[PDB]
């Protein structure tokens with residue numbers, strides 16, 4: 599790790615984020631603008647995703 | 648943990664396992680279905 603190495607030799611920070619669920623309970627979510635529950639009328643649901 | 652020294656050999660026996668050992672293969676609820 600020479601201080602003046604070429605960019606092809608300089609430290610990167612390659613980190614991998616892996617994620618693939620099938621039916622496990624959710625524990626991570628994004629912006630999450632989750633609203634209130636609605637009733638027997640036809641509604642577009644997002645629930646768990 | 649001390650070395651126990653009162654074992655009596657008696658080589659183990661075998662038992663015919665019956666219809667046991669089935670868990671819930673997946674996490675999805677079902678009803679009145681036969682799933683392979």
Ligand SMILES: *[C@@H]1O[C@H](CO)[C@@H](O[C@@H]2O[C@H](CO)[C@@H](O)[C@H](O)[C@H]2NC(C)=O)[C@H](O)[C@H]1NC(C)=O
Nearest residue numbers: 648649650651652653654655656657658659660
């Ligand atoms: C009796 O206890 C010793 C204590 O570890 C077990 O380990 C044996 O003796 C020394 C440990 O200082 C090792 O160098 C030997 O290789 C160990 N022997 C074996 C067969 O692993 C020892 O195993 C115990 N005796 C038993 C369980 O019969």
